[PDB]
Sugar ABC transporter, periplasmic sugar-binding protein (Thermus thermophilus), 413 residues
Amino acid sequence: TLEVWIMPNSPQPAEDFKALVAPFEKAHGVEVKVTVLDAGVAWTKITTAATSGVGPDLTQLGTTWVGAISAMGVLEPVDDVLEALGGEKAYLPAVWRTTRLEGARQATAVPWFSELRAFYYRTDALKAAGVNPAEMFASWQGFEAGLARLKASSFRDPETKAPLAPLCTPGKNSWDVLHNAAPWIWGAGGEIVRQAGGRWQSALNSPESLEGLYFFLSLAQKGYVPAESLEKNTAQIEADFQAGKCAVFASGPWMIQRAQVPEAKGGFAERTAAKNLGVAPYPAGPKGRYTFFGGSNLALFNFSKNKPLAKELLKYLGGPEAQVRYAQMTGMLPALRSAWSDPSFQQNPLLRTFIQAAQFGRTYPSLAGWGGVENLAVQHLGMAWDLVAQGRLTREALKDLMDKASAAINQAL
Ligand SMILES: [Cl-]
C-alpha cells in the first residue's frame, strides 16, 4: 500500500483520485490509500508530518509551499522522476521553477497541475460597446479604453435587464489578493522580490511595481468596478459573471467546463454569459505580457517505507495519461506540456486560448519564507484596497504603504 494526501481538487475529491490511480493499482498489484485534507487544515497537517516524521508517502503541495517544506530537509530528491518525464524541456519555465527551493541543486517536487489566469469577457457586451477584444487585451491603454466604452455602453443583459459592470475583481477579501496584482506588477517591469548579492528583498516599492499596482487599483477608483465587488472573493465574482452582472473578469480554465454544465448541476450553461463567452490573455504592460501561474505539485517524504514504488506513482501521476484525465477532473491545465495537445483541450478554442496565455507564464521565486512575504504584501495591498474603496488612493499613499510593506518583508527575510 501507498498513502497519498491531496486537497479537494475535483468535485468528488477521493472518488476522482481513486478512479485516476485504479490503472496504476491494477498494473503494480498495490492499493493507494488517499486522505483528503480540507484547505483550512492541509498546511498544518503537512507541517506536523514534516516535524514529527509520521505521515503519508506522497503529499500534494501548493507550488508556493515547495520552498518551506524543501528547506525542512524532509523531502526525497525526484530528479530521476523529472528526467523520466522528459526533464526541463517537458515543462513551462514558470512550472519548472516550482520543482525545487530557489537556488537548490536537487528537485524536491513533481508538477501535477497548473492554475493560470486570463480574462473572460461577454462577447455580446464588447460588441454592443464597439470594443474589439484584440484591441482591449493588446495593451494597458487598450484595456482601460475598453472599460471606458463598456461603462458608457447602453447594453443590458437580456435576462437581468440591467447594465453590466465593466470589470469585476476582488479587493482584499480573497485568497489571491497578490496573484490578482502580480501580472500588473510584472507587466510594468516590476516584481514582488528582487535578489541582491545572494540575499532577497522587497521590490514592491520599486517605481515599476508602483506603476503596475496603481494602474490596476485605480481602475476600481474610476467607476469600472462596482463597490460591492471589493467585498467579495473570486468564487463570488465568478457567480456575479455567471448571473450576467460583469462584462470582464479574470479566472482559471475551469469556468469553460462550468459554461457547459446546467445550473442544476453547479454550472451556468443556460445563462447568457455561457453562450457569449470569450477568453483573452492578460494585456501587455509597458515591459511585457505575463500570466500568473500557481497550482499543485506532489512530493515524497524521505521517511517513506516505499520510495521506489512511490516514485513509480509520481511518474504515473506526472505522465501523459493521468496528466490529461486529472486536468479534466480539476478544470486545470496539465503541468506536463505534451498533454496540452490532447483532443480534450485542442477541440475547445477557449481552452486553446489558455494554452496561448500559458506561453507568458511567470510565478514567484520558490523561497523558504514565501508565506511571510505574501502575507505582509497582502496586508498592505489590503490597506491600499481600503483607500480605493473610499476613492482616496493616490500614487503617494500607495508608495507609503508599499514602503511599510517593504520594511517588514526585508525584516522577515
Ligand atoms: Cl516576483
